Amino acid sequence: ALPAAPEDLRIVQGPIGQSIIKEGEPTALTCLYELPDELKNQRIQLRWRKDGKLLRQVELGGSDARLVLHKQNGTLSFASIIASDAGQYQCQLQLEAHAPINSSPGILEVIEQLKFVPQPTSKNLELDAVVAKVHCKAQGTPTPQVQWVRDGENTTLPDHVEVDANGTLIFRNVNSEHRGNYTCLATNSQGQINATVAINVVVTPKFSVPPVGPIETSEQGTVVMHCQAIGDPKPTIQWDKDLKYLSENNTDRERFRFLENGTLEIRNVQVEDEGSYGCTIGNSAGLKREDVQLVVKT
Ligand SMILES: *[C@@H]1O[C@H](CO)[C@@H](O)[C@H](O)[C@H]1NC(C)=O
Ligand SMILES: *[C@@H]1O[C@H](CO)[C@@H](O)[C@H](O)[C@H]1NC(C)=O
Ligand SMILES: *[C@@H]1O[C@H](CO)[C@@H](O)[C@H](O)[C@H]1NC(C)=O
Ligand SMILES: *[C@@H]1O[C@H](CO)[C@@H](O)[C@H](O)[C@H]1NC(C)=O
Ligand SMILES: *[C@@H]1O[C@H](CO)[C@@H](O)[C@H](O)[C@H]1NC(C)=O
Ligand SMILES: *[C@@H]1O[C@H](CO)[C@@H](O)[C@H](O)[C@H]1NC(C)=O
Numbered sequence: 001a002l003p004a005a006p007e008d009l010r011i012v013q014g015p016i017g018q019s020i021i022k023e024g025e026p027t028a029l030t031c032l033y034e035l036p037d038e039l040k041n042q043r044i045q046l047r048w049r050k051d052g053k054l055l056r057q058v059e060l061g062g063s064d065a066r067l068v069l070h071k072q073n074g075t076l077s078f079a080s081i082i083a084s085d086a087g088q089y090q091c092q093l094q095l096e097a098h099a100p101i102n103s104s105p106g107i108l109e110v111i112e113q114l115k116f117v118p119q120p121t122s123k124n125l126e127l128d129a130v131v132a133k134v135h136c137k138a139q140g141t142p143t144p145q146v147q148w149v150r151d152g153e154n155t156t157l158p159d160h161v162e163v164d165a166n167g168t169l170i171f172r173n174v175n176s177e178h179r180g181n182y183t184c185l186a187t188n189s190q191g192q193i194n195a196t197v198a199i200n201v202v203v204t205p206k207f208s209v210p211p212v213g214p215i216e217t218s219e220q221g222t223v224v225m226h227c228q229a230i231g232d233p234k235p236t237i238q239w240d241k242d243l244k245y246l247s248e249n250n251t252d253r254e255r256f257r258f259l260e261n262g263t264l265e266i267r268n269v270q271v272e273d274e275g276s277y278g279c280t281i282g283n284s285a286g287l288k289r290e291d292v293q294l295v296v297k298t
Contacts, residue, residue, distance in 0.1 A: 005098040008036040015089055015106025021081050022111040029106055031074030031091035035060050043096035048076045051087045083139060086110040114140040114190040122198040125174045134169040138186030151181035151196050176201055204286030205235035211279050213292030221269045225292055227262040227279030235283040237262045242276050271296050
């Protein structure tokens with residue numbers, strides 16, 4: 001129950017009753033004011049509120065951003081409208097220790113861009129994964145309907161593929177038939193947008209020929225240890241000793257032979273050659289390692 005503000009302090013041109021603006025467009029809401037000279041040194045605040053919440057304020061009397069409030073004329077200016085700018089706006093002229101002067105409210109409606117939020121992207125699913133999900137959400141005016149189809153010659157979603165009420169594409173017990181290009185369509189009266197994404201099915205490496213040991217030999221003998229892998233993408237193999245990689249850069253080049261088929265052959269075995277040798281198999285999907293003990297008998 002604060003005292004009323006003086007009559008010469010007033011909002012001359014408040015916001016328009018209703019504005020409709022397209023997302024991406026600039027706009028501005030008005031709050032032209034008259035500030036009498038006998039208050040120029042008082043604490044006077046011009047505030048803009050959105051849905052009842054303070055949004056911008058500037059002191060009018062005593063002591064590149066997208067959304068700014070201009071001191072001289074009270075304009076709330078939007079350099080570019082975004083969907084969340086929609087709401088009910090009101091400006092206030094507030095002298096310290098007095099009742100605020102309230103403008104009429106102004107409704108700001110935004111014609112939203114038809115677009116995905118966010119835009120679906122390509123995914124790699126693990127073979128035999130129990131559940132895998134690909135979200136699809138869009139905005140627009142009105143809110144668009146979202147659906148999934150398969151791209152290409154056969155548009156039907158494979159078995160154990162479904163779309164839930166949120167537009168989420170769901171794969172159950174991922175198998176090789178799930179691989180393909182899948183299209184999310186968002187449709188309303190503004191048109192239709194189409195995000196097609198690659199859904200690949202990958203397989204972490206597995207040993208087809210794992211290293212097998214213990215490998216026992218005598219000094220000056222020759223040993224071989226094997227490593228071959230399968231997977232999708234085609235895995236690479238890498239030899240280590242005690243988790244330290246092995247190559248020509250750190251082994252005797254006339255004794256250690258790294259064959260193309262994954263086999264490691266050690267000629268003229270020495271006592272120091274003993275230890276734990278490992279093969280790591282890897283692709284873009286994952287990694288595995290298996291090790292073997294090399295025993296050198298005196
Ligand atoms: C208020 O002043 C600013 C700064 O010059 C200007 O950009 C804006 O257009 C003005 N408001 C109106 C409604 O003209
Ligand atoms: C299209 O794909 C579905 C789902 O995998 C399958 O059941 C159907 O037989 C396919 N149709 C043709 C003509 O290949
Ligand atoms: C849809 O999303 C909401 C969250 O907005 C969640 O609570 C609900 O469980 C989801 N529905 C399904 C079927 O996943
Ligand atoms: C998707 O389309 C691209 C381009 O046509 C093609 O190379 C690819 O094999 C298709 N399928 C997947 C799973 O990416
Ligand atoms: C979706 O867009 C792709 C291009 O990315 C196109 O090849 C495909 O035919 C479109 N699908 C539909 C149902 O419009
Ligand atoms: C790799 O090739 C070498 C030489 O031909 C052979 O001795 C070895 O057994 C091969 N490894 C496997 C796992 O076949």
